[PDB]
Write an enzyme that holds these catalytic residues in place. Structure first.
Site, short mmCIF file in Angstrom:
data_model
loop_
_atom_site.label_atom_id
_atom_site.label_comp_id
_atom_site.label_asym_id
_atom_site.label_seq_id
_atom_site.Cartn_x
_atom_site.Cartn_y
_atom_site.Cartn_z
N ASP A 1 -2.74 5.59 8.51
CA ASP A 1 -2.13 4.34 8.95
C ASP A 1 -0.70 4.67 9.44
OD1 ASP A 1 -0.65 1.55 8.05
OD2 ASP A 1 -2.74 1.04 8.51
N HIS B 1 -10.87 0.74 6.79
CA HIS B 1 -9.71 1.45 7.31
C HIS B 1 -8.99 2.21 6.20
CE1 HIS B 1 -6.04 2.21 9.61
NE2 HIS B 1 -5.31 1.47 8.75
CL LIG Z 1 -1.95 1.98 11.86
#
Ligand SMILES: [Cl-]
Ligand SMILES: [Cl-]
Lengths: 296, 296
Positions: B104, B271
């Site tokens: 991220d 994610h």
């Molecule tokens: Cl990101």
């Protein structure tokens, strides 16, 4: 100068809503529909002049201002539902066919009304709005930064309600300043009315619901019309903010894909045309309504 | 199982920041960089295993967790600045060249570090991130709805700080659940650390500043590299979320435009790869680091 001198304030009871309306004048009917985050008072610089020659009806959209849905748990805030509110409103007042002048979300109610109920709409004026289908096709980085609230307010219940509801006056005031591009356009008394509405959690929720509908059912309705080749059947005027438009995005061009009879002009003001540029708007509106007097 | 057994917690004093770091192990150095809205504890399922064979350095990014900028009025939170923090951190610890594994926002620090300081980066692993230039090119309606916060948090100071700061725990918890796709992946004690950081208004501000930089200076840096034909000089691994990718948007394809030596794989998780799929991540990471042992 007083606000809306001589306007008669009504509360209409319709099948699905309790609607705040203000009326003045005689002659051919005009329905004026405000947008976000405002109320019918946004028309205070325009509606008095129009009432000299026309029957003028100002309404708070369902959920905005003092208008409320009767279902306060799961009401429909789609443009199609608010369009039906307009049919019922004008019908109760004695009008089966009328011109519609909208700004911002009210222009979106208006064109949906014209598409769904062409027998009811004599003429349509959009103040700085094109159909939502066209807006969504235009989304890119700069659009999403500029119009971040279109994405925030469409998030699932109750995310945006929680965020915008924490300090409602801060968010309202920020939003109005930004939409006006910092210009000193808000009458202090109209402002207090916008503020009081925004302090009501039901209003804030209805606004979110509007933005959710824009993503979903409203866009689906526009696509179905595009698929069918259905166009507005009345004369259309679009008055747009003077700014650069990318290819395919010029508002006159867009409206010509949605209607066979279109005219318009650029106005050098913010998006808040009713409050920022009322004299320019009036000049164009009065000329359009006079030129299509037979249509009325 | 305890969290980060045997890790030694340090506070490093660098030119522009006071940085929280945790270290364990011996052998070739690896720097692991968390993302939003987290801290170095996001690595708790991965870092112990790596420390069996490598020198592992975990850091809180500037402004996140317990790391702070020394300028608390106008600090630089660009990826370039945070990349320099990494150079100083690893240098102080005794390493002039090291592998970088990011997730991220930390992957964004990492690739910027590799581009700006190629002599320092032996190998780079991106967990579910491509360069911001590529992300911005991908913006459309669905992107902006899905990633609405990329647009909210980039609005000018202090709009998003006011909104996200009203009920910080509500917003943090909402965000973590959403990013995990509702999966039960957060260790309750790691969660308390993420929560405490997010309750600090300085952390929330630094997060906004990250998102502002992503729009502005970070994208400008990526464009300058693209213009120059500058690529990462080290082996690259990208591990991405298994989902459909539009043409031009597949992460392996994208990374091959940024680096001459690229490999990767899809992982069937959210994610939040470090917490959601640590065994799969470890299997790929260990194989990559072993295969490029000479590069290290
Ligand atoms: Cl990101
Ligand atoms: Cl609008």
């Amino acid at each position: 100068d007083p606000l809306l001198p001589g306007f008669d304030y009504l509360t209409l009871h319709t099948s699905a809503a309790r609607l705040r309306v203000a009326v003045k004048g005689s002659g051919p009917p005009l329905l004026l529909l405000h947008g976000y985050p405002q109320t019918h008072l946004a028309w205070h610089r325009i509606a008095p002049r129009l009432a000299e020659d026309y029957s003028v009806v100002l309404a708070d959209l369902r959920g905005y201002g003092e208008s409320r849905a009767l279902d306060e748990e799961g009401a429909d805030y789609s443009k199609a539902a608010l369009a039906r509110d307009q049919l019922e409103t004008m019908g109760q007042l004695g009008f089966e066919r009328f011109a519609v002048i909208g700004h911002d979300r009210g222009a979106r109610v208006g064109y949906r009304l014209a598409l769904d109920h062409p027998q009811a709409v004599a003429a349509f004026v959009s103040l700085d709005v094109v159909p939502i289908l066209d807006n969504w096709a235009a989304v890119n980085k700069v659009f999403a930064l500029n119009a971040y609230h279109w994405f925030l307010l469409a998030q699932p219940y109750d995310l945006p309600e929680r965020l915008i509801g924490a300090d409602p006056e801060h968010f309202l005031d920020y939003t109005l300043r930004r939409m006006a591009q910092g210009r000193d356009i808000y009458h202090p008394q109209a402002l207090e009315s916008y503020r009081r509405a925004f302090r009501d959690p039901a209003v804030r929720h209805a606004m979110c619901e509007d933005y959710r509908a824009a993503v979903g059912v409203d866009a689906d309705a526009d696509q179905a019309d595009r698929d069918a080749g259905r166009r507005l059947q009345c004369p259309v005027q679009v008055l747009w903010q003077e700014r650069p438009y990318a290819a395919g995005q010029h508002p006159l061009e867009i409206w010509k894909t949605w209607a066979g009879q279109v005219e318009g002009a650029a106005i050098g003001a913010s998006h808040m045309l009713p409050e920022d540029a009322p004299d320019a708007v009036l000049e164009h509106l009065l000329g359009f309504l006079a030129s299509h007097r037979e249509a009325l």
